[PDB]
Enzyme design. Structure first.
Site, PDB file in Angstrom:
ATOM      1  N   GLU A   1       4.319   4.051   4.214  1.00 24.38           N
ATOM      2  CA  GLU A   1       3.475   3.468   3.211  1.00 24.38           C
ATOM      3  C   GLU A   1       4.136   3.708   1.855  1.00 24.38           C
ATOM      4  OE1 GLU A   1      -0.519   5.097   2.280  1.00 24.38           O
ATOM      5  OE2 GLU A   1      -1.033   2.971   2.653  1.00 24.38           O
TER       6      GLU A   1
ATOM      7  N   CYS B   1      -4.960   1.223   0.150  1.00 23.82           N
ATOM      8  CA  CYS B   1      -4.865   1.676   1.485  1.00 23.82           C
ATOM      9  C   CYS B   1      -4.578   0.507   2.446  1.00 23.82           C
ATOM     10  CB  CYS B   1      -6.192   2.371   1.880  1.00 23.82           C
ATOM     11  SG  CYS B   1      -7.702   1.423   1.560  1.00 23.82           S
TER      12      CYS B   1
ATOM     13  N   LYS C   1     -15.046  16.272  -5.211  1.00 27.73           N
ATOM     14  CA  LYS C   1     -13.828  16.625  -5.919  1.00 27.73           C
ATOM     15  C   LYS C   1     -13.022  15.393  -6.316  1.00 27.73           C
ATOM     16  CE  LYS C   1      -9.873  17.308  -5.748  1.00 27.73           C
ATOM     17  NZ  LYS C   1      -8.800  16.911  -6.690  1.00 27.73           N
TER      18      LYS C   1
ATOM     19  N   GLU D   1      -9.939   8.724   5.735  1.00 24.48           N
ATOM     20  CA  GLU D   1      -9.334   7.422   5.580  1.00 24.48           C
ATOM     21  C   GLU D   1      -7.991   7.702   4.877  1.00 24.48           C
ATOM     22  OE1 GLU D   1      -9.314   4.480   2.625  1.00 24.48           O
ATOM     23  OE2 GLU D   1      -7.589   4.422   3.961  1.00 24.48           O
TER      24      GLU D   1
HETATM   25  N1  LIG Z   1      -5.948   5.998   1.475  1.00 20.95           N
HETATM   26  C1  LIG Z   1      -5.726   5.697   0.214  1.00 20.95           C
HETATM   27  O1  LIG Z   1      -6.283   4.705  -0.293  1.00 20.95           O
HETATM   28  C2  LIG Z   1      -4.784   6.635  -0.499  1.00 20.95           C
HETATM   29  C3  LIG Z   1      -3.563   6.963   0.078  1.00 20.95           C
HETATM   30  N2  LIG Z   1      -2.736   7.826  -0.532  1.00 20.95           N
HETATM   31  C4  LIG Z   1      -1.418   8.103   0.085  1.00 20.95           C
HETATM   32  O2  LIG Z   1      -0.952   9.421  -0.118  1.00 20.95           O
HETATM   33  C5  LIG Z   1       0.308   9.442  -0.797  1.00 20.95           C
HETATM   34  C6  LIG Z   1       0.474  10.674  -1.699  1.00 20.95           C
HETATM   35  O3  LIG Z   1      -0.446  10.615  -2.789  1.00 20.95           O
HETATM   36  P1  LIG Z   1      -1.217  11.926  -3.365  1.00 20.95           P
HETATM   37  O4  LIG Z   1      -1.830  11.550  -4.652  1.00 20.95           O
HETATM   38  O5  LIG Z   1      -0.294  13.165  -3.238  1.00 20.95           O
HETATM   39  O6  LIG Z   1      -2.499  11.900  -2.405  1.00 20.95           O
HETATM   40  P2  LIG Z   1      -3.339  13.154  -1.880  1.00 20.95           P
HETATM   41  O7  LIG Z   1      -3.805  12.940  -0.467  1.00 20.95           O
HETATM   42  O8  LIG Z   1      -2.761  14.459  -2.034  1.00 20.95           O
HETATM   43  O9  LIG Z   1      -4.535  13.199  -2.994  1.00 20.95           O
HETATM   44  C7  LIG Z   1      -5.840  12.639  -2.799  1.00 20.95           C
HETATM   45  C8  LIG Z   1      -6.936  13.692  -2.999  1.00 20.95           C
HETATM   46  O10 LIG Z   1      -6.687  14.813  -2.119  1.00 20.95           O
HETATM   47  C9  LIG Z   1      -6.662  15.997  -2.920  1.00 20.95           C
HETATM   48  N3  LIG Z   1      -5.782  17.029  -2.348  1.00 20.95           N
HETATM   49  C10 LIG Z   1      -4.440  17.239  -2.535  1.00 20.95           C
HETATM   50  N4  LIG Z   1      -4.020  18.352  -1.859  1.00 20.95           N
HETATM   51  C11 LIG Z   1      -5.096  18.847  -1.201  1.00 20.95           C
HETATM   52  C12 LIG Z   1      -5.421  19.963  -0.291  1.00 20.95           C
HETATM   53  N5  LIG Z   1      -4.466  20.835   0.107  1.00 20.95           N
HETATM   54  N6  LIG Z   1      -6.704  20.125   0.159  1.00 20.95           N
HETATM   55  C13 LIG Z   1      -7.670  19.275  -0.217  1.00 20.95           C
HETATM   56  N7  LIG Z   1      -7.445  18.269  -1.065  1.00 20.95           N
HETATM   57  C14 LIG Z   1      -6.238  17.988  -1.558  1.00 20.95           C
HETATM   58  C15 LIG Z   1      -6.219  15.517  -4.303  1.00 20.95           C
HETATM   59  O11 LIG Z   1      -6.456  16.548  -5.277  1.00 20.95           O
HETATM   60  C16 LIG Z   1      -6.992  14.247  -4.433  1.00 20.95           C
HETATM   61  O12 LIG Z   1      -8.364  14.506  -4.806  1.00 20.95           O
HETATM   62  C17 LIG Z   1       0.315   8.131  -1.536  1.00 20.95           C
HETATM   63  O13 LIG Z   1       1.631   7.736  -1.867  1.00 20.95           O
HETATM   64  C18 LIG Z   1      -0.389   7.193  -0.583  1.00 20.95           C
HETATM   65  O14 LIG Z   1       0.489   6.648   0.383  1.00 20.95           O
HETATM   66  C19 LIG Z   1      -3.027   8.378  -1.732  1.00 20.95           C
HETATM   67  C20 LIG Z   1      -4.219   8.151  -2.394  1.00 20.95           C
HETATM   68  C21 LIG Z   1      -5.196   7.229  -1.822  1.00 20.95           C
HETATM   69  C1  LIG Z   2     -12.892  -6.191  -1.866  1.00 22.73           C
HETATM   70  C2  LIG Z   2     -12.738  -6.975  -3.125  1.00 22.73           C
HETATM   71  C3  LIG Z   2     -13.903  -7.310  -3.822  1.00 22.73           C
HETATM   72  C4  LIG Z   2     -13.836  -8.035  -5.014  1.00 22.73           C
HETATM   73  C5  LIG Z   2     -12.605  -8.445  -5.529  1.00 22.73           C
HETATM   74  C6  LIG Z   2     -11.415  -8.123  -4.861  1.00 22.73           C
HETATM   75  C7  LIG Z   2     -11.395  -7.401  -3.643  1.00 22.73           C
HETATM   76  N1  LIG Z   2     -10.083  -7.148  -3.077  1.00 22.73           N
HETATM   77  C8  LIG Z   2      -9.536  -5.826  -2.846  1.00 22.73           C
HETATM   78  S1  LIG Z   2     -10.376  -4.370  -3.108  1.00 22.73           S
HETATM   79  C9  LIG Z   2      -9.269  -3.119  -2.480  1.00 22.73           C
HETATM   80  C10 LIG Z   2      -9.982  -1.914  -1.932  1.00 22.73           C
HETATM   81  C11 LIG Z   2     -10.772  -1.146  -2.772  1.00 22.73           C
HETATM   82  C12 LIG Z   2     -11.440  -0.023  -2.292  1.00 22.73           C
HETATM   83  C13 LIG Z   2     -11.321   0.327  -0.960  1.00 22.73           C
HETATM   84  C14 LIG Z   2     -10.530  -0.446  -0.126  1.00 22.73           C
HETATM   85  F1  LIG Z   2     -10.419  -0.049   1.301  1.00 22.73           F
HETATM   86  C15 LIG Z   2      -9.851  -1.563  -0.600  1.00 22.73           C
HETATM   87  N2  LIG Z   2      -8.269  -5.621  -2.353  1.00 22.73           N
HETATM   88  C16 LIG Z   2      -7.416  -6.637  -2.062  1.00 22.73           C
HETATM   89  N3  LIG Z   2      -6.153  -6.752  -1.586  1.00 22.73           N
HETATM   90  N4  LIG Z   2      -5.744  -8.110  -1.472  1.00 22.73           N
HETATM   91  C17 LIG Z   2      -6.764  -8.895  -1.895  1.00 22.73           C
HETATM   92  C18 LIG Z   2      -7.844  -8.035  -2.266  1.00 22.73           C
HETATM   93  C19 LIG Z   2      -9.219  -8.268  -2.783  1.00 22.73           C
HETATM   94  O1  LIG Z   2      -9.559  -9.463  -2.943  1.00 22.73           O
END
Ligand SMILES: NC(=O)C1=CN([C@@H]2O[C@H](COP(=O)(O)OP(=O)(O)OC[C@H]3O[C@@H](n4cnc5c(N)ncnc54)[C@H](O)[C@@H]3O)[C@@H](O)[C@H]2O)C=CC1
Ligand SMILES: Cc1ccccc1-n1c(SCc2cccc(F)c2)nc2n[nH]cc2c1=O
Ligand SMILES: [Cl-]
Ligand SMILES: [Cl-]
Ligand SMILES: [Cl-]
Ligand SMILES: [Cl-]
Ligand SMILES: [Yb+3]
Ligand SMILES: [Yb+3]
Lengths: 493, 493, 493, 493
Positions: free
Chosen positions: C392, C295, C185, C261
């Protein structure tokens, strides 16, 4: 540090085969001496070819399919090893005393370190027994494929005189945990502790023929093992000379698996930013430990010019504190060398350092009216073509040398056919990682030296040996992998 | 099964060092022949000691700390291997044709199997490159300990003439994935495909000196590798004779790591309950494959009395269907032997089977006016002291023998200094598992034979070799483990 | 840095099931926008419960015993993954452009980094396919025991909008290499690249139903996956809020395996002895990368008092160099935030930093007439109870804080329910090792930040997630272990 | 089979925290009964929320960086586990008697099997302690990357009443070997052996707070563990109902890692070619063991039509030999059920089998004037929609069913939301391998049943649980992986 409160009575002096004591076939016996006094301790049955043949027949028979040692649970092999360890812990006073008296080994080390290492290594190896696993493999085509990590079979194991007990356990621990049978040839200088342990193997309940111990000489009993057509594998620690002979004997006879640990000329590289006291202490212990009679002895110490004079001065200070004497007497901090040959070799090399124009800081000659004692000796301004910079001395003889170019010193450190170990002393992360990566050595210590444990594999680069002992990795060298591939109608992931 | 629609033009005939083509130092060249017609194909630069020294200097230099091959990402080593595989896939028609013409190898097998195996094995090995990992270890005391699984260094690799390409890839795949540099000595009979592949190594972009190929003779170029003081490891597939020589040369010179695969006298045990047709087919292919010129040839087939006559009759039927001729002509199902020496050896052994009173079912002599062709031959009622039951024939010569006692036949099957492989044919689970466990052989097949894949480690028990190739386990033999132990203020789990 | 020399035409906008394009069951479609201009790009079929049910039936069916995906060689799974990678490499310009336009992602990063990571990770995962192995185990008693590391089955995979492509490949790479089938999804914001990749999965030749992609909303399509009774496992990257909902839905429905995650509040600890410029640069990139929408964003930076003012000053200098604008225009160095919700959340939190008495160094407000742009903002003198220190932000908002007590700062760094990652900057070996050991975080960088690669497992401590992705270790989370134990007459080691 | 020659005096009845005995905060106590007589044995301190909070604070504190449990050698953790095992071996008579009296467990099994399994599993787990290793990883770019396999932290462990001691050791063995601290909630029915073991943990010398034991009820003490914000992980064996509650509580609170083992409805498939007696015996023991109160109970037995009547007849014969009575009296071969709830559940389900038209072969009702005894009962002609074919009975109630189509029976066997284990009985190799591969179950036995050992990982497919216990693989679930990535000037392979 407790002691035996009763004089050591020697009891076990025979050849151990099928859990029983045997005279030599020839009827011959050889003397065993105390290196501190030069007096005979007892006579021991001299094993030779014919006796080795008896031990190998016993070990083959114990390895047969369907025998108790092959069919018992892996966990029960482990159980027997843990029991042996408890027995050795039980007779620790006695064993440490025997080791010291026969080996010329400081009693406090014998007790606190050799005996401890034996016990701990046996326990380590006991834990591996039922965790030796093969694989299931997603081979191409419609087949089921698995591997068995079987024992190899009869392993001949030739042990040196510097660490008789530790080396015995380093050999038998792994071999037995994996399910091999063994024929052990202790050093002719130091059969006695191995035969005490043999009594304990019997008391622990190992099936007869799982461990056999044939005391005797190298060109006799040793050559018979290396050349034996029904020994599957030989392991050896000792001289490079003999290592070559084992390998070639093995090539000519039955192509048995060979592994070797062959000493070194191990370097330390001390950078200007190093904790100086810490570096001086470890480097010092790293060369003097057990009268220099360690495979890993730090026998070339390269120190950055700006701290070289300080490093030298403190090192001399440290070397000048030793008390030589009977390894059994408390407060004695340096025993004798093992025997005449090693003694002559050390004096000869000390003489070469003088003649070749190295700077003598302390020591330089023998000590006492008996015992094979050598004064702890330090050379500074040693250069790379001097004999003392190139040859393993195996005596209490420390070499200290200057560098100022880091690329250059790594190349000097690597410029040796040895490669057992090295030491790097610095506070800089990058230098710790990049230097250790660039050194051609099996173990590299950083800001320490001589740290060896059952959990870490141990062995040489280059002519310091092949294969590894101990750790997970060491266990591989005591298994033979069999691949089993079964035709099936249809596989599924 | 497509073909080259253009005559094969030979192009690569030089010594390959530092990604360039070199004449022999001596200026000498040697002939290369087609085994099917006995006609010279071309002349090739004859490598000898001096040329091996050039290749070793190149390989040492490419292995130096800081070089492109040491500092590039592991994943990029893998990338280069996957690219080489694609190149070999690109020139598959050409390579398969060259292999067949120079190797006397049936073209349909060369194409569908040897070329496929090369490609698939390279791809397998490419995937391992960045998945070679060491360990972090919870050593006693306040230390951080890790291991690096480094490449060994310069690896000398001596290859036979039966599977020139497959063996090349079996050697270089693993070696290169782990980050070694190599000096390859192809069989004097069969240098040509290896040099084509050398062009592809260059085109793929391997750093110069990572792969060097020195065509030449065994006592010349081969002995120089085995005895070379700056070669860290030699791998070899071939005769037992030479295996002994490599091991001893290595012992005398620099104690280089040695691994060997040395052929066999591999047994099949066929139980009464076996699927008979399946057993006859696999056993038949298991001995006749590539004119019997396989290390794993099923050269002793023990069949339970009650189905022995049937087994024999069907086997003869099967052996009588072959068409001998040019390995390039479609419908041809048996090529020539590689050369005169192998040819004479096969005829001589066939003669011994007759004289020793084995029963000749079919074949028994040579075929044709040229080529080193030998009629596919079957002996029944063979007994265990006959030369044909004991010696590796390496020809299309099948031995069939009777048993009625299962304990007895396992002992007969194991009663050989060989131990490369075996086959067990039965429908009973318990017997499949217990027999395969009891056979002293590196690979045991159940209800099949000759199933070999990149995912499975492969090698011998006893005098069939030491160490394993391929699979996860094989990769261990191309690494050298270094333990790094750092002093720390205080550790935590 | 090459570009598409042709306008991007959007083509793939349907639900992908059994390798074909499907309308939504409801007939509904939803808009997809460009975050830089706020204009609709296209309409996409809206998947919901009913569509998820179709994808799950397809994935179940593709996972059945005897299907092409279960019976094909492991190596052939790998082959398909390597082919997909080559396809993605083929359409790299196109994909990078689509990613940038739909994701608000700088094109130079999209191309050089996201696309590269996709390709490299697929290749990594391809290499594991035929190296997933079980064990043979020396169990007590007379039994043969092995394990199979089977695929789990149907895996539901819910992906966020920050790294649409990378996250897709991070999910499907491992899942497919191990032999699972998947229902993906994508984020409702960012379906478009995933559907292009779906076309490539078809072109590569994956069996139908191995990969299914259902674009749609979270409470609709996402909730249907988490609560689905025939989905064996759900993997998710996103908000903590949703993570809780997935886990609970899974508990109530069929107890499916869950891995998560969930972002972080990752700290850096900068010691006085740190290379200051290096620390400022990595910490800066560590928080600002992709508009803070990572993240692992380094959202709390603790700097030792004696260099705190310098650290702050240089950091502000660095943050003041950005050029905001269309992520597609060369020289543009900061794109917009993904959408309104994230935008409002960032502004609100910036407002809290002001109100709570943090010191504003630069930025602090929105930018432009369209797009969800936010000025890069730095706060100094932030304290641990401020909202901006605790929550965050996921925006370009950097927090800088002072410490002088090392024990204290480790405790402050750990004092969070998050634990995804951390950074330590120092030149001292002991401090590098002991600090990193003491930090409660899944990845700890030393003297760098944001270094993430296919070879390393990746995931959270505490509420930053459970389980690991990628590396050897990640592969475990896509297998289900089955132990098979066969009675035998008698075992042998 | 020796016995206690002295009446059992109950001594340990308190809450165990920080190696001391505590009253309940509330002051409350609850009764503990003997299931054979229905008489109270003693009163035990009732733990609740507040007590769980005390145990968690103790366990957190013992897990802190720098504490004795974090800084001690791994080998010393192992040493403590091996010592505990020796203590349990010392008090084996006593413990086996306590287990039997409180658990309604046959004394001969309690002694020979439960106590043995405890001892052996502790020893197994002791051996792993210093062999838990991370990796060094050849990551892209100039970095040094390693992983640490750290303990997770505070682990809450909720244990059932069927195997109180075995389950205690299955939980604490692994947890402690890896270096976690634990909060154990024994079953309210069966606290007594766990508290004896707590005394032994103290006597062995575990640091205080490493193991804490809080006896009490499920919705009280159990819910407090599952919902606790400072517990890093909960492990649970028990009902599906509670499993759902744990998982959801964990989702809502702190997203703690969860692993579950939840019973089964495990099938055996008996083919016509099976050794019939062997199949009848193992299938019989597989369902009746410990009064049917085993997670792995073989509660659906599918037998090929042509031997179905024979299979049924012999099974009835076998079930008719039991002697019910006090689990302590020698010659007694069937004890009572644990309690009223289980008793009522069993009778109710037996009633459903009658009503739904299954054929009653023997048993069918209660037995005796006290104790929760149920006659051993057999149903034949059971069909797949009957309650007794679908629901875990957990009583001595065997179901036997007919098949004639093999594809069909595999589908019937898999057609359950459970998947803990299965049994296949045949002499055909292909069928053994292909059936076991196709069964959706965590352990599959071939020609045996109920063979469980410390060396093998153990756990469920589907709703029978998640994760694995024991074996190498189980150890993974008690570690948290941290990746550490250090910037370096230049890497080398
Ligand atoms: N770990 C990471 O890299 C990420 C962290 N976040 C965090 O979450 C915060 C809120 O962002 P959102 O876009 O609202 O993230 P979210 O967690 O809601 O969205 C991410 C995914 O989860 C899905 N989702 C939403 N509600 C759901 C439900 N009830 N059941 C199953 N799937 C569902 C979305 O459709 C999307 O595919 C962000 O500000 C950020 O801090 C958001 C996106 C990525
Ligand atoms: C990993 C990498 C490969 C090639 C070029 C850049 C990077 N990279 C990134 S990628 C961020 C990322 C993307 C996907 C998943 C994760 F958990 C984190 N995030 C960064 N944050 N600060 C420096 C970063 C970096 O160099
Ligand atoms: Cl290792
Ligand atoms: Cl293996
Ligand atoms: Cl890892
Ligand atoms: Cl496993
Ligand atoms: Yb706006
Ligand atoms: Yb009653």
């Amino acid at each position: 540090l407790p002691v035996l409160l009763t004089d050591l009575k020697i009891q076990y002096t025979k050849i151990f085969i099928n859990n029983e004591w045997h005279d030599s076939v020839s009827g011959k016996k050889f003397p065993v001496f105390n290196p501190a006094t030069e007096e005979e301790l007892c006579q021991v049955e001299e094993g030779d070819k014919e006796d080795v043949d008896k031990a190998v027949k016993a070990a083959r028979q114990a390895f047969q399919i369907g025998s108790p040692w092959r069919t018992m649970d892996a966990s029960e092999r482990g159980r027997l090893l843990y029991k042996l360890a408890d027995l050795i812990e039980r007779d620790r006073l006695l064993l440490a005393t025997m080791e010291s008296m026969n080996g010329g080994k400081l009693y406090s080390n014998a007790y606190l370190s050799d005996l401890a290492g034996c016990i701990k290594t046996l326990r380590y190896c006991a834990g591996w027994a039922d965790k030796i696993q093969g694989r299931t493999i997603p081979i191409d085509g419609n087949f089921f494929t698995y591997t068995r990590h079987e024992p190899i079979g009869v392993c001949g194991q030739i042990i040196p005189w510097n660490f008789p007990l530790v080396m015995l356990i380093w050999k038998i621990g792994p071999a037995l945990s994996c399910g091999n049978t063994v024929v052990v040839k202790p050093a002719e200088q130091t059969p006695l502790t191995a035969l005490h342990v043999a009594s304990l193997i019997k008391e622990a309940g190992f099936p007869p023929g799982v461990v056999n111990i044939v005391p005797g000489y190298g060109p006799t009993a040793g050559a018979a093992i290396s050349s034996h057509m029904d020994i599957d594998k030989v392991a050896f620690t000792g001289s490079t000379e003999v290592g070559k002979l084992i390998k070639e004997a093995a090539g000519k006879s039955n192509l048995k698996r060979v592994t070797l640990e062959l000493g070194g000329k191990s370097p330390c590289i001390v950078l200007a930013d190093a904790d100086l006291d810490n570096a001086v202490e470890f480097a010092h212990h790293g060369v003097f430990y057990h009268q220099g009679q360690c495979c890993i002895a730090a026998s070339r110490i390269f120190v950055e010019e700006s701290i070289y004079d300080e490093f030298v001065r403190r090192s001399v200070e440290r070397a000048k504190k030793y008390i030589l004497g009977n390894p059994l007497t408390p407060g004695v901090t340096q025993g004798p060398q093992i025997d005449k040959e090693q003694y002559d070799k050390i004096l000869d090399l000390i003489e070469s350092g003088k003649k070749e124009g190295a700077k003598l800081e302390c020591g330089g000659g023998p000590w006492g009216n008996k015992g094979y004692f050598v004064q702890p000796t330090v050379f500074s301004n040693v250069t790379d073509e001097m004999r003392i910079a190139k040859e393993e001395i195996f005596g209490p003889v420390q070499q200290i040398m200057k560098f100022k170019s880091l690329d250059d010193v790594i190349k000097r450190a690597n410029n040796t056919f040895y490669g057992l170990s090295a030491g790097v002393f610095t506070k800089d992360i990058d230098k710790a990682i990049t230097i250790s990566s660039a050194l051609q050595a099996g173990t590299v210590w950083v800001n320490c030296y001589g740290v060896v444990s059952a959990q870490c594999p141990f062995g040489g680069f280059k002519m310091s040996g092949n294969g590894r002992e101990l750790g997970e990795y060491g266990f591989h060298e005591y298994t033979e992998v069999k691949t089993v591939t079964v035709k099936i109608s249809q596989k599924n992931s």
